[PDB]
Amino acid sequence: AAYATLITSDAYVMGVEALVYSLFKARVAFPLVVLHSSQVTQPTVAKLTRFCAPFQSSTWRISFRSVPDIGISGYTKLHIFAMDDFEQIVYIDADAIVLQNVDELFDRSTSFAAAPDVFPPDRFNAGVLVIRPNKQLFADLLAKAKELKSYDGGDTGFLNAFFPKWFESDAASRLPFGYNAQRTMYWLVNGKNPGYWNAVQPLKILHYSSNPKPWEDKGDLEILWWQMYTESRCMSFLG
Amino acid sequence: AAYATLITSDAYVMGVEALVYSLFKARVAFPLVVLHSSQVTQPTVAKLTRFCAPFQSSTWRISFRSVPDIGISGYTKLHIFAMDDFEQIVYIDADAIVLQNVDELFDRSTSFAAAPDVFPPDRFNAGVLVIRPNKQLFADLLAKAKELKSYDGGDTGFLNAFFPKWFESDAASRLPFGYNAQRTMYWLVNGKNPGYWNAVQPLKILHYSSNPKPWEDKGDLEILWWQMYTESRCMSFLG
Numbered sequence A, B: 001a002a003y004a005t006l007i008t009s010d011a012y013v014m015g016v017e018a019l020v021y022s023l024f025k026a027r028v029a030f031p032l033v034v035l036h037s038s039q040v041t042q043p044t045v046a047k048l049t050r051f052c053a054p055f056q057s058s059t060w061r062i063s064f065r066s067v068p069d070i071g072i073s074g075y076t077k078l079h080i081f082a083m084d085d086f087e088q089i090v091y092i093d094a095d096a097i098v099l100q101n102v103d104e105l106f107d108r109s110t111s112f113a114a115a116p117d118v119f120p121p122d123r124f125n126a127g128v129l130v131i132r133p134n135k136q137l138f139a140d141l142l143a144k145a146k147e148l149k150s151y152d153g154g155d156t157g158f159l160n161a162f163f164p165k166w167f168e169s170d171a172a173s174r175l176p177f178g179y180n181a182q183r184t185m186y187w188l189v190n191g192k193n194p195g196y197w198n199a200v201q202p203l204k205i206l207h208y209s210s211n212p213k214p215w216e217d218k219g220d221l222e223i224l225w226w227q228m229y230t231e232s233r234c235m236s237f238l239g
Ligand SMILES: O=c1ccn([C@@H]2O[C@H](COP(=O)(O)OP(=O)(O)O)[C@@H](O)[C@H]2O)c(=O)[nH]1
Pocket: A005, A006, A007, A008, A009, A012, A092, A093, A094, A095, A096, A127, A208, A209, A210, A211
């Protein structure tokens, strides 16, 4: 079993670094695979590898894997379904950070789990996925990628069209929102109804969905991201 | 089995009237019980009864029931759990309208079903409830009403505290969002991402949550409510 993340542009390297360090800080008991697509330049890969080196130990491995871009690079994330050298993958977007150990996600008996999106709340968000790789399912995703329209023009819309009965699936396949707590809800509710956000307990993964990404541009959640990132740079370079 | 709605203030009488007529227009095959609490004046009850009279027939009955207010009248809705002269109740807020026949809701084998709220999407909204009445459960709701805090200060917060594992429950107990399509999502997404709202298919019950209520004060959904209400007044008085 492994955690996996994805980088398809040099500009997201700071997101990966914050995520890597948040997993290190949470003492996760499974290795991490960083997928990087063709558009990520080799110097950025080398920089990322150097940043991760001080977090490597005999008890935690961070590995790197080249993957081809999957165009609509908008579908490159589908590569997690082909990683069948692993029985189970916990995939996390590079614009998320882990606040608490989430190793229990590997205890879910399902081939596919995701957390609900906020709009609408009976569809799922594709930023956190717990999957069991299967190369035949991967092939059919690739094939259907040229047929199924996506209501958000991205991988979330496409995956919901491919798994339209996710909402009806068992509890193992539907992650609580605390495993993919999207800052878009915080932005909307914090000023008037902050109690809606405080209801999300435990809050284990923060997802910095929508734009700009925190490294691209001072809300409370963005302060938290920079706290994680700057500590990561401090510990990687000085620790 | 029956549909049920609730009025706890004279000012919501226009909401009840739009809802009653939307159920009539959808040709629902089960009767409707209108709960009215003590604060609703007798003349308003009489007006409502006269408005409903032309929709009464040998094949559809609208009945009225006095219920005592349940204070925190904020918990008066809990009275649906005591209606054990019915095996099953589909409860709908008076600020909703039915756009399509929803008689299939009575085919769900569960004691309690609700649709997800938008914030957060792993809690439920209490505006549409499919329940099997049970006077012992009612007693425990009343008892716990003096103990469990509500994260929104209302019945939705309280019922989520009472049923905190709703998200983990079976598909029968978790209604698709189309059975409680809250206009708050439309307000937020229509301008920028209208495709999120169009994903809600079928859209069977529109819930005019938040304020002001349409009869209290010209968005697209509010135009739709007034279309339903004004046709209802036309057919009740002229049809
Ligand atoms: O320019 C990009 C866009 C996407 N990604 C990767 O694809 C994931 C999904 O994209 P994104 O998080 O920006 O979408 P959102 O969550 O805002 O819908 C990102 O987290 C990254 O892992 C990336 O590396 N560079």
